[PDB]
Write a protein that binds this DNA or RNA. Structure first.
Ligand SMILES: [Zn+2]
Lengths: 246, 439
DNA sequence: TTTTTTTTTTT
């Protein structure tokens, strides 16, 4: 699951499908920190793994060895297949107040943290920004009087969670909004994501450099041994062919 | 002889070497690379020490083969660390570790000489210090570019505390920077971190093989150099995985002598573990070591047979097909004529591992009374060792082995850490004393 | 994020 780490996730059906109804949380601190955006390069190779953050999240392309090696070789076109395997992944995080969850009725009426993907962020951006001409003025889902809850619906297509069907709803007042204690009761359920944004990011670039080195060898721009990594692929297959040559 | 008359790095170390004895008590490790000639400098410190008459030194080599050639060239006898420290195993079900019987005082040993100090592991490291007395002074030789030990339980930087600043101050060795040697200057670049490049003098040097058919071309070049020569003592091919080596010995065996055999009579093989002649004794039998790990041996007779194994508490005996090869001592060690049972089938090997697990399932919680038949555990477990043919060994298992010509196979290395890949290199390059080819 | 998706090597 995910709840033990403190983050809610969906109880997937046999098809992997799932429906749930939740309301969001505004900004934990005043005039700042409504939400969060996480960047993480994630890949698996040689059985070795890498799942850690990126400092280019705050624009520091330099304090990340996974960022630098791209710019030296421009893998985006130099080796785009290798580029996609390792490229930075953008994670969006927010607090959530659950309303209805038939997959797990215990999850209802409670608040969590959560990470999602970018299409929703465009739709979140598409929902929040509306013109004045379409009568419907823009709406904040976290607004106490104007905000809206939203229902997530996902099906699997070729092993991918698809969300193209998602639709939003009207505004909604939140019941018991005039009680400080009911607010406080839920307010402690709110957590501050800005703490995750402070100086928690690894300052030691050389430490990150060491771990991938243990994860994988080769790939040195000034060393140019990465060509030998290109070359190594041929030899294993060449080894297979020479085995029957016996 | 020449006595005090060498280079600054050679002169500086010995004076500091004396200082550790002379100034307070201190322990030092030296990062001598190859070619820097700290072995030649060590020869003098051998000579200089005899005039003082100190016997507190002990000649220690971590491996038997390094101790053998150390004793052979120097002429002075050296002992194994397992004898020096009486490390005795402890039979448990989950894990098992050789363990020193007691902390000795090491009174007669007032100075300590060690080799290949990178190899000794950190968990063992803490135990040894208490065993070591203050008056004894520790002298260590090793390369930071030498290969580190493998710890399945912990994957970390794990630099040998010999190489960690807090334990004690030490000094590195300078090197004859320039010389008319292509490989070492390439090896200098190898220690620097440049990728391998071919450099040749008089037709001999570092040589590369490139292109689509490079391997087959390198293979015919491999075939060209080797031919049907039965003397590979100076021809050592090295690869990391034993998977690759297994397919090699399969193919390679058929090449030199015209037989399709997994193993044929008359083959030369090397131990992968020491050979103990175990006797049943209270506590732990220290047994008698017959063949050391790394000992070369000549096969006397070769045959593939089967043997039924029966465990008390397990009904009946269980047949396992293996190789029953008889082998004799090859080398300068004590001569012994022996015969071993050895399994060389993946089908049988997984069959072998399964028996252990049922025996593991039953022995960990046995209670029909009594204790447990573990005398039939090791007697059945120790009947078979694991050894591999001479031509190829792992870069781990090729360390120390100085041969004339080395052929190098790189591709499987990417699963290893970067620093290890360079430490394999240094060690790998140092295996070829005369020449090296690289594909 | 659907999930730490490969090695052997020491007494
Ligand atoms: Zn990055």
């Amino acid at each position: 699951s995910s709840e033990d780490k403190g983050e809610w996730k969906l109880k997937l059906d046999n098809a992997g499908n799932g429906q749930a109804v939740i309301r969001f949380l505004p900004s934990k601190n005043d005039e700042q920190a409504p939400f969060a955006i996480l960047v993480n390069h994630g890949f698996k190779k040689n059985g070795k793994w890498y799942i850690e953050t990126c400092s280019s999240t705050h624009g520091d392309y330099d304090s990340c060895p996974v960022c630098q090696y791209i710019s030296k070789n421009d893998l985006y076109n130099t080796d785009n297949k290798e580029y996609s395997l390792v490229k930075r992944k953008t994670s969006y995080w927010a607090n959530i107040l659950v309303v209805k969850d038939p997959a797990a009725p215990e999850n209802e009426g409670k608040v969590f943290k959560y990470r999602f993907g970018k299409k929703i962020w465009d739709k979140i951006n598409a929902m929040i920004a509306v013109d004045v001409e379409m009568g419907e003025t823009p709406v904040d889902v976290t607004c106490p009087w104007e905000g809206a809850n939203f229902v997530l619906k996902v099906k699997q297509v070729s092993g991918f969670s698809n969300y193209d069907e998602s639709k939003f709803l009207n505004q909604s007042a939140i019941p018991n909004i005039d009680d400080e204690s009911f607010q406080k009761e839920l307010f402690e359920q709110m957590v501050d994501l800005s703490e995750m944004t402070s100086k928690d990011k690894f300052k030691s670039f050389e430490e990150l450099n060491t771990k991938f080195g243990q994860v994988m060898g080769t790939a040195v721009m000034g060393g140019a041994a990465a060509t030998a990594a290109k070359k190594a692929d041929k030899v294993a297959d060449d080894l297979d062919a020479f085995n029957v040559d016996d | 002889m020449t006595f005090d008359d060498l280079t600054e790095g050679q002169k500086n170390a010995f004076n500091i070497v004396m200082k550790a004895i002379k100034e307070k008590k201190h322990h030092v490790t030296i990062n001598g690379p190859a070619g820097t000639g700290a072995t030649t400098l060590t020869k003098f410190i051998i000579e200089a020490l005899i005039s003082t008459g100190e016997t507190g030194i002990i000649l220690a080599a971590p491996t038997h083969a390094a101790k053998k050639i150390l004793s052979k060239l120097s002429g002075k006898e050296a002992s194994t660390i397992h004898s020096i420290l009486k490390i005795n195993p402890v039979t448990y079900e989950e894990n098992v570790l050789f363990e020193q019987k007691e902390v000795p005082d090491l009174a007669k040993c007032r100075v300590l000489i060690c080799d290949e100090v990178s190899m000794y592991d950190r968990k063992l490291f803490k135990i040894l210090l208490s065993t070591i007395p203050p008056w004894c002074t520790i002298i260590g030789i090793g390369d930071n570019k030498q290969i580190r030990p493998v710890d399945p339980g912990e994957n970390t930087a794990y630099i040998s505390p010999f190489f960690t600043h807090k334990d004690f101050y030490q000094c590195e060795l300078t090197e004859v920077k320039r010389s008319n040697a292509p490989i070492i200057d390439v090896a200098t670049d190898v220690r620097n971190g440049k990728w391998i490049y071919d450099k040749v003098v008089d037709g001999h040097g570092v040589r590369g093989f490139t292109g689509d058919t490079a391997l087959r071309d390198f293979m015919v070049n491999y075939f060209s150099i080797v031919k049907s020569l039965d003397d590979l003592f100076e021809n050592r091919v090295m690869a990391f995985t034993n998977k690759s080596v297994d397919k090699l010995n399969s193919i390679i065996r058929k090449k030199i002598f015209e037989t399709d055999k997994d193993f044929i009579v008359g083959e030369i093989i090397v131990m992968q573990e020491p050979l103990f002649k175990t006797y049943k004794i209270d506590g732990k039998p220290v047994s008698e070591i017959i063949f050391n790990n790394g000992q070369l041996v000549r096969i006397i007779e070769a045959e593939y047979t089967s043997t039924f194994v029966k465990a008390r508490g397990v009904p009946g005996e269980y047949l396992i097909r293996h190789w029953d090869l008889t082998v004799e001592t090859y080398g300068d060690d004590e001569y012994y004529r022996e015969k071993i049972k050895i399994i060389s089938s993946d089908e049988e090997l997984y069959k072998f591992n399964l028996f252990l697990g049922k025996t593991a399932e039953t022995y960990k919680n046995w209670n029909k009374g009594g204790k447990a038949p573990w005398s039939d555990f090791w007697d059945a477990k120790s009947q078979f060792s694991k050894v591999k043919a001479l031509p190829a060994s792992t870069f781990h298992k090729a360390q120390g082995m100085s041969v004339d010509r080395a052929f190098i196979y790189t591709p499987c290395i990417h699963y290893a850490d970067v620093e290890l890949a360079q430490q394999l290199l240094y060690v790998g390059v140092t295996r070829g004393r005369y020449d090296v080819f690289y594909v």
